[PDB]
Amino acid sequence: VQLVQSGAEVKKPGSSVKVSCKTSGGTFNSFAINWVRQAPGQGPEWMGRVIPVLEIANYAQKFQGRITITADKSTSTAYMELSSLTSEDTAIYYCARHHIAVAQPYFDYWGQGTLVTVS
Amino acid sequence: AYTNSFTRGVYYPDKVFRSSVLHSTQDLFLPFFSNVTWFHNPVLPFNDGVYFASTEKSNIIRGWIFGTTLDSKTQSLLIVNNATNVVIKVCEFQFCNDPFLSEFRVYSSANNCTFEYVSQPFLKNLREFVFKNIDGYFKIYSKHTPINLVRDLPQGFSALEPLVDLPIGINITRFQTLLAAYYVGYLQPRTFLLKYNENGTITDAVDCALDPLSETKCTLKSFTVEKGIYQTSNFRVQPTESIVRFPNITNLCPFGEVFNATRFASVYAWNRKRISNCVADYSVLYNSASFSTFKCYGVSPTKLNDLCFTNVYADSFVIRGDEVRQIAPGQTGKIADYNYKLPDDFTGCVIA
Amino acid sequence: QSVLTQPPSASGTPGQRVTISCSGSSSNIGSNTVNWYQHLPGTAPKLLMSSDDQRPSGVPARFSGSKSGTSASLAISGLRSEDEADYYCASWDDRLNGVVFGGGTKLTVL
Amino acid sequence: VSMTKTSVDCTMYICGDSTECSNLLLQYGSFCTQLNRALTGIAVEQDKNTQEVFAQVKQIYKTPPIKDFGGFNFSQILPDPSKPSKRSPIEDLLFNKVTLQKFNGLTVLPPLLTDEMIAQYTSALLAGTITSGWTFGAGPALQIPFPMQMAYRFNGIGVTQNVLYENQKLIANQFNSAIGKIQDSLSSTPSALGKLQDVVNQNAQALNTLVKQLSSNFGAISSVLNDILSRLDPPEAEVQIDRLITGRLQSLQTYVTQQLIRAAEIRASANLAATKMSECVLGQSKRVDFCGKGYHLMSFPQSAPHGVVFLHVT
Amino acid sequence: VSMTKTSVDCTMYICGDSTECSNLLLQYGSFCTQLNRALTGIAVEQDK
Amino acid sequence: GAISSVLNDILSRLDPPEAEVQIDRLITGRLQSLQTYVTQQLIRAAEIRASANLAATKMSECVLGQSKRVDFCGKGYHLMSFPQSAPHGVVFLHVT
Amino acid sequence: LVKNKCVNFNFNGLTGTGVLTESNKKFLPFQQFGRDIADTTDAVRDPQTLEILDITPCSFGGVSVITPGTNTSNQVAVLYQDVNCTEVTGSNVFQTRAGCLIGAEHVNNSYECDIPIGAGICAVASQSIIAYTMSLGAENSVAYSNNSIAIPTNFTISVTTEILP
Amino acid sequence: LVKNKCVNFNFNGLTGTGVLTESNKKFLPFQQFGRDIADTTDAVRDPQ
Ligand SMILES: *[C@@H]1O[C@H](CO[C@@H]2O[C@@H](C)[C@@H](O)[C@@H](O)[C@@H]2O)[C@@H](O[C@@H]2O[C@H](CO)[C@@H](O[C@@H]3O[C@H](CO)[C@@H](O)[C@H](O)[C@@H]3O)[C@H](O)[C@H]2NC(C)=O)[C@H](O)[C@H]1NC(C)=O
Ligand SMILES: *[C@@H]1O[C@H](CO)[C@@H](O[C@@H]2O[C@H](CO)[C@@H](O)[C@H](O)[C@H]2NC(C)=O)[C@H](O)[C@H]1NC(C)=O
Ligand SMILES: *[C@@H]1O[C@H](CO)[C@@H](O[C@@H]2O[C@H](CO)[C@@H](O)[C@H](O)[C@H]2NC(C)=O)[C@H](O)[C@H]1NC(C)=O
Ligand SMILES: *[C@@H]1O[C@H](CO)[C@@H](O[C@@H]2O[C@H](CO)[C@@H](O)[C@H](O)[C@H]2NC(C)=O)[C@H](O)[C@H]1NC(C)=O
Ligand SMILES: *[C@@H]1O[C@H](CO)[C@@H](O[C@@H]2O[C@H](CO)[C@@H](O)[C@H](O)[C@H]2NC(C)=O)[C@H](O)[C@H]1NC(C)=O
Ligand SMILES: *[C@@H]1O[C@H](CO)[C@@H](O)[C@H](O)[C@H]1NC(C)=O
Ligand SMILES: *[C@@H]1O[C@H](CO)[C@@H](O)[C@H](O)[C@H]1NC(C)=O
Ligand SMILES: *[C@@H]1O[C@H](CO)[C@@H](O)[C@H](O)[C@H]1NC(C)=O
Ligand SMILES: *[C@@H]1O[C@H](CO)[C@@H](O)[C@H](O)[C@H]1NC(C)=O
Ligand SMILES: *[C@@H]1O[C@H](CO)[C@@H](O)[C@H](O)[C@H]1NC(C)=O
């Protein structure tokens, strides 16, 4: 299958941005969705994941109540919104999927990515 | 209250060293994404195994109680703990209604005790235990790990090593905790694909039967499946209800008229009375203690109450002295040859 | 900073073999598996290496992986031009309760 | 060319819907899996035989609407558009002359290629041979008039082509008369298709014996598994059960071995049919008596249930 | 081209001229009839 | 069906008059397993032999000469062929 | 007694599992039960009411999994061999002569066969798994006439490989 | 214990015949014997 993300977004510091990642039909239930960014001149960093069939979410310890990940079953679309945007939050955001019947995570297919610029 | 049991609860099944191999094994494991009851205590069923787990900051939990009735009526495990000498004494101790042992409690008035063993002590630290009883062996597996600022099962995978294999051999049917949160889970028979890297220390696992994609993966013992058609299982429809049909008849058979006869016939001229068209309740004769021996050939004595027969004949005679044992199929002797001879394929029982 | 340390640069000659390393600590590498991803700018990454000794379906017989102690390595034989890309090593971290990624290395074919 | 794709499940056959017996069966190791491999192996091999013999053409060829073949009458071998199934008269006669339950663990799998597709492949081969000779085998189909094609086939057996043109009318009349006689013989002389009927009979007899073996006692007190288990206590029943397991397992092993040998004979026949098709229908054979008695000119394939019928013109 | 056309009678080989054994042999069903059939089949094709 | 698969452990615990009965079950079970292995090998050997005979015919009638029989030496009009060895087999290069 | 369902019955000690239905086999007054060629019951006479109940084994069969490959999608289809769809991923249900196929959408237009299923049906394309009747190859016709011949003007040399154990 | 000769040994109930030599396989502290493919003992850990 494939993952399709929203277009590039341009935002002002102090605002909020919402980025979606729309998937196929069977990619819910027994599949998790992970969010990965890559700051310029920096290595990739993990944020969190959500299991749509269980509606349970996990967050990185560094993002203390700033990130919330939600998803709906009717439209089959996952959403990410981040609050208190600052200058260092500019990066390229990816959405990638995991298979749920494996103990140790291993990302299989990646999205094309979206670019968020702040100024 | 409930929480979701994460990928926790995998243990080493066999104490055998293996290397560089994917081995498929069947045993009682905790299913992934199961709930597990969260308590903040009451008596819980033990069934076939418990994944007991607890987190804490100090040594508030000090022991466990295992048994059947916990009233000195059956043997009961009293594994208990203290700062430096763990003591196990499986004996019929009579326990209080709500044990809470600076002084001692519930294990008072122990008439006699049959087992004692000593080991090194068990108990920001998460403590996982697994209790299983297999063919007369109480097995405990455990692992201690540094937990961090998390308020639930800490995510990830870790295998549990064995600690003791105490040969107690009792039932254990119910359980209770002693003195404040726990994660009680229950084990179920499921098949896992276990990955041993090279020194033998389990590095991954795949839970089969989770979904159609996962079943093909275990059957091929690979993490990638090539294009094609694969046969993975067999569908079988189970029956929905039982129907019992029997002939309409309420007459009772005169068993009192054969066993309590005024005078029995001689063995050379034994009597043969035919019993028919009646309901024969054989449970009284089976439970009756007045018989010296009750050996049944052909049918087992406890299922004879369900089966039905066209006719039954009761041959009654008296034999005195030795040779009484000769009344059996394929036996030889003066009695078997000249007095009473049973057929080779006789199906029934002799009572004396 | 990335918990896993990798050499910022690496180079190799056409036709020969080259070795890339990924070093960590006992909390992440020593207790968990590693994965290798190939990345080209302007495109999505791919899975090269899973469960640190198991090869995926697509990639051909050439890429090989090994793990020893607290260090891991990837071996490329029959080096060719299209192998120009970035390489990343990742592994679960028990202390941080999350995935940690390596710094990434630029491989250059002369 | 082929036989029915049978398959038997050892577990349901030996230890039918009873968990108590199955636990004893697990003590015999791999016996229940080396037999499943053998039966699966034969079923897969049957599809390879049919595909290699018939699927020899990359494209589906079609005959022209006007049958201007120089006086030659092919109306008895080309499909009849008026029938609900595009079969020719002769092949339709063969389907009307050969004549061909629910058990426990016994199933029959359908073939991958239905009869409709097999008939369509033979039409493509016959239409090709008429319009292009042997050229469609080597590469692309190059049309050539049919009388000129027949002149070359005469040249191949040492008779100069000038013999054909002066006697063209005589040859055409003899060909049409010879074709008419073939239908009367097949419709009137029985046993002609005995080679195909024998395979069906041998397979049916093997299955009838295997089912009948379930009524035997092998020394146990009763042949029905449920009545022994329902009256004797587990501690004593193991001896009575063990006798039935050993007897039924030995019977199943005999059935599988006979099928492996029998499958090998049919495979040899299928390989010969593919060899004849390539060197007789697509070309012209100089091999004596390989494509019938006489000097071979040309051949026509026809389908039949579980086989192929060749008309050799000499 | 060919081999000797042998034939073995399953009943006389296993049990012989004894009725007492034959009654036990009947408990195994068709094992003999399946053997006599196989040997007849081979003997006939040797002439073809 | 025996009490244990290791022959020395049963013989070391049971008396001769009863150990002979238990051992007989293991002897009978292992002998029947050996017969099955041998039988499958006899059939499998026959398949390879048929293939080897075909390979000898192609080599003689394709490499040493030129074959006029259609599709015996590949698709097309046969010119020549080149043999090459391989593990447990032979590979033919057909020029058409 | 409950009819038309797989049940475990017990008639005067005779046990078994099957569907009990009405029958039209005229038993004569003296016979009570009939048996198959195998030592198992084919039909039986009920007690108390004296009626003829037919016993047909409840349906069972193998389960096969259809999957496209690790290069395309994680959607799969499951084929229940030789069973009807009137009994049990749950998206679409298509009844075929090979069994009941669940998860594949039926598309009317034919293509070349890819994954064989059986009975002429083969089965990723257009973001979903499809099932269709297999094509036998491209259709073409030769320009036959009674006075035209085609002669090749050029040639190509090819090499093929044959492998034999 | 006698090394480098085929001897009939008994280690904690595990019996067999073979030549005993030193090995470099790092067993974990709780495992006592290792077996290779197809159920065959390849090494064992001595007591004492
Ligand atoms: C399986 O175990 C072997 C044996 O090593 C021993 O057991 C392990 C469980 C660890 O506790 C080891 O510390 C212990 O020695 C492992 O092989 C050994 O790996 C270590 C770690 O790389 C090697 O030691 C290093 O050697 C380099 C090069 O000399 C030094 O620079 C380092 O300072 C360090 O000493 C050791 O040589 C090696 N043993 C050999 C080659 O015989 C093996 O890695 C382990 N399997 C795993 C971890 O997957
Ligand atoms: C034969 O006589 C005995 C003795 O009278 C009967 O057994 C008694 O049954 C009564 C009523 O159930 C009990 O109260 C007694 O305790 C029983 N006594 C003994 C010694 O069994 C018996 O029911 C009679 N009939 C038989 C044996 O068929
Ligand atoms: C998975 O990786 C690639 C990505 O699709 C697959 O490549 C195709 O494979 C098929 C079957 O061999 C070929 O017919 C295609 O031409 C290949 N396409 C490309 C673009 O390479 C690969 O086959 C898959 N893995 C395996 C083991 O087959
Ligand atoms: C027959 O076909 C061959 C190959 O298709 C033709 O050879 C090619 O000719 C063109 C024009 O000169 C060259 O550019 C190609 O390089 C040739 N091919 C090769 C493989 O050398 C040949 O010309 C054709 N015959 C005729 C008469 O045109
Ligand atoms: C088994 O018992 C013997 C005898 O008590 C132990 O022998 C000692 O082994 C140590 C090994 O470091 C030596 O230093 C001592 O000199 C030995 N003798 C005594 C009296 O201690 C042996 O260690 C024991 N084995 C195990 C595994 O505990
Ligand atoms: C816990 O179990 C209940 C029913 O057993 C069900 O809601 C689900 O399996 C679990 N619930 C949650 C919220 O995980
Ligand atoms: C633990 O219990 C044992 C059993 O009575 C006792 O001897 C020992 O002193 C106790 N240890 C401590 C630290 O109280
Ligand atoms: C104690 O004595 C009783 C005798 O009444 C006996 O049944 C029991 O097995 C003994 N042991 C224990 C631990 O109760
Ligand atoms: C049971 O009682 C019914 C009463 O309606 C009677 O018709 C039937 O014959 C009886 N069954 C017997 C006598 O077997
Ligand atoms: C071929 O023969 C059939 C036989 O009845 C006849 O109907 C048909 O017209 C003939 N075709 C030609 C072209 O003469």
CATH code of residue B11: 2.60.120.960
CA of residue B133 to ligand 8 center, whole Å: 22
Chains contacting A (3+ CB pairs below 8 angstroms): B, C, G
Q: To the nearest whole angstrom, how far is the Cα of D253 from the nearest Cα of chain B?
A: 22
**CA–CA distance, A84 with A65 (Å, rounded to integer):** 11
Sign of torsion over alpha carbons B211, B215, B218, B222: negative
**Contact C97/G at CB under 8 A:** no
Q: Which two tokens stand for residue A85?
A: 């945007």
Grouping H, G, I as helix, E, B as strand and the rest as coil, residue G22 is strand
Q: Evaluate: CB of D73 within 6 angstroms of ligand 10.
A: yes
Contacts for C6 with CB less than 8 Å, ≥ 6 apart: C20, C21, C22, C23, C89, C102, C103, C104, C105
Q: Do residues D125 and D135 touch, judged by C-beta distance below 8 A?
A: no
From H23, H25, H26, H27, give the residue whose CB has the most ligand 1 atoms within 8 Å, as the site to mutate: H26
Nearest-Cα residue of chain G relative to residue C46: G71
**Site of tokens 């034994």:** B270
Of the residues B78, B80, B82, which should be mutated to test ligand 7's pocket, given the most ligand atoms within 8 Å of the CB?
A: B82
Gap from CA of H46 to ligand 5 centroid (Å) = 14
Say if B83 is an interface residue toward chain D (CB within 8 Å).
no
Structure tokens at F68: 């006029």
Q: How many angstroms is it from G153 CA to the middle of ligand 4? A: 12
Query: What SS3 string covers chain F?
Result: CCCCCCHHHHHCCCCHHHHHHHHHHHHHHHHHHHHHHHHHHHHHHHHHHHHHHHHHHHHHHHHCCCCCCCCCCCCCCCCEEEEEEECCEEEEEEEC
Cβ(B92) to ligand 8 under 6 A? Answer: yes
Structure-solving method: cryo-EM
Residue whose CB lies within 8 A of the most ligand 1 atoms, among C68, C73, C91, for a mutation test: C68
> CA nearest B211: which of B36, B51, B32, B35?
B32
Whether residue B246 lies within 8 A of chain G, CB to CB, comes out as: yes
Torsion sign across C-alpha atoms B220, B225, B228, B229: positive
**Taking CA atoms, what residue in D is nearest to E38?**
D258
Q: How far apart are CA A80 and CA A75, in angstroms?
A: 15
Query: Residue A89 belongs to what domain range?
Result: 4-118
- Is B213 in contact with A100 (Cβ distance < 8 A)? no
Name chain F's partners: 3 or more CB pairs within 8 A.
D, G, H
Q: Does F9 touch chain H (CB under 8 A)?
A: yes
G143-157 core/surface letters (b: 16 or more CB in 10 A; e: else): ebeeeeeeeeeeeee
Q: B13 lies in which domain range?
A: 1-220
F60 contacts chain D (CB < 8 A): no
Nearest to B169 by CA among B138, B193, B136, B146: B136
Nearest to D68 among G56, G98, G146 (CB): G146
Distance from CA of A58 to the nearest CA of B (A): 10
Ligand 10 atom closest to residue D75's alpha carbon, by position in its atom list: 1
Is the separation of the CB atoms in G61 and G99 below 8 Å?
yes
- Taking CA atoms, D296 is separated from C20, D163, D289, E39, G93, in Å, by 71, 17, 9, 40, 55
Burial classification of residue C94, based on how many CB atoms lie within 10 Å of its CB (0-12 exposed, 13-18 middle, 19 or more buried): buried
CATH architecture of C9-109: Sandwich (2.60)
CA distance B210 to D39: 30
Contact D286 F70 (CB under 8 A): no
| C-beta B87 within 6 A of ligand 7 | yes
Q: In a mutagenesis test of the B interface, which of D33, D231, D236 is the best target, namely the one with the most B β-carbons within 10 Å? A: D231
Beta-strand relationship, B312-316 and C35-39: unpaired
How many CA atoms lie within 13 Å of D301's alpha carbon, on the beta-carbon side? 27
Nearest CA in chain E to D247: E28
B170 pocket-lining for ligand 8 (C-beta < 6 Å): no
Whether ligand 6 lies within 6 angstroms of the CB of B35 is answered as yes
- Measured between alpha carbons, how far is F84 from F91 in angstroms, rounded to an integer? 5
Q: At what angle do helices D31-54 and D115-132 cross, to 10 degrees?
A: 30
Ligand 6 centroid–CA A55 distance in Å is 12
Residue position matching structure tokens 């046990």:
G15
CA G99 to chain CA centroid, Å, is 3
Q: For chain C, state the CA radius of gyration.
A: 14
Contact D282, D137 (CB under 8 A): yes
Spell out the domain ranges in chain C.
9-109
* Residue from B78, B79, B84, B104 to probe ligand 7 pocket by mutation (most atoms less than 8 Å from CB): B84
Residue A74: CA atoms inside 13 Å, Cβ hemisphere, count?
A: 0
Contact G159 F93 (CB under 8 A): yes
| Contacts C67 to B, Cβ<8 Å | 197
Tell me whether chains E and F touch (3+ CB pairs under 8 A). no
Contact call for C96 and A105, based on CB within 8 A:
no
- Indicate yes or no: CB of C54 within 8 angstroms of CB of B223: yes
Q: Is B249 on the interface with G (CB under 8 A)?
A: no
Per-residue exposure over D67-96, b if at least 16 CB sit within 10 Å of its own CB, e if not: eebeebebeebbbeeeeeeebbebbeebee
Ligand 2 site, residue B300, Cβ cutoff 6 A: no
Looking up residue A94, the CATH number of its domain turns out to be: 2.60.40.10
Residue of the nearest CA to atom 6 in ligand 9? G48
d(CA G107, nearest CA chain A) in Å: 19
Cα B141 to Cα D186: distance, rounded to the nearest angstrom: 80
What is the CA angle A5-A6-A7, rounded to 5?
125
How far is the centre of ligand 6, averaged over its atoms, from the C-alpha of B172 (Å)? Answer: 28
Number of other residues whose CB lies within 10 A of the CB of residue E7: 9
Contacts A110 to C, Cβ<8 Å: 44-46
Contacts (Cβ under 8 Å, ≥6 apart) of B319:
B267, B327, B335
Dihedral of the alpha carbons of A8, A12, A16, A17, in degrees to the nearest 10 = 0
Nearest atom within ligand 7 for CA of residue B85: 1
Domains of chain A: total: 1
Q: What is the 3-state secondary structure (H, E, C) of chain B?
A: CECCCCCCCEECCCCEECCCEEEEEEEEECCCCCCCEEECCCCEECCCCEECEEEECCCCCCEEEEECCCCCCCCEECCECCCCCEEECCECCCCCCCCCCCCCCCCCCCCCCCCCEEECCCCCEEEEEEEEECCCCEEEEEEEEECCCCCCCCCCCCEEEEEEEECCCCCCCEEEECCCCEEEEECEEEEEEEEECCCCCCCEEEECCCCHHHHHHHHHCCCCCCCEEEEEEEEECCCCCEEEECCCCCCECCCHHHHCCCCCCEHHHCEEEEECCCECCCHHHHHCCCCCCEEEECCCCCCCCCCCCCCEEEEECECCCCCHHHCCCCCCCHHHHHCCCCCCCCCEEEEC
The residue whose CA is least distant from atom 7 of ligand 9 is G48
Residue reference for tokens 């069939």 = A53
Distance from CA of F96 to the nearest CA of D (A): 10
- CB-ligand 9 contact for G8 (6 Å cutoff): no
Final resolution, Å: 3.5
Q: Classify D226 as helix, strand or coil.
A: helix
Q: Does any CB of chain B come closer than 8 Å to the CB of residue A104? A: yes
**Cβ pair D59, D274 in contact under 8 A:** no
**D111 at interface of G, judged by CB pairs closer than 8 A:** yes
Q: Report which of B306, B194, G98 is spatially closest to residue D111, judged by C-alpha positions.
A: G98
G75: chain A residues, CB-CB within 8 Å = 1, 24-26
Q: In whole angstroms, what is the distance from residue D146 CA to residue D129 CA?
A: 10
- F69 and D138 within 8 Å at the Cβ level: the answer is no
Q: Is B232 in the pocket of ligand 7 (CB under 6 A)?
A: no
Residue G157 and residue G145: Cα distance in Å, rounded?
31
Give the residue carrying structure tokens 């992970």.
A34
Closest CA to D282 of F69, B19, B252: F69
At E29, list the tokens. Answer: 């069903």
In this complex, which of B156, B157, B211 lies closest to A30 when CB atoms are compared? B211
- Asked if B313 and B275 touch (Cβ cutoff 8 Å), the reply is yes
Query: Ligand 3: residues within 6 Å at CB?
Result: B 226; C 57-58; G 70-71
Interface of B with D in 306-345 (CB under 8 A): 307
F95:G159 CB<8 A: yes
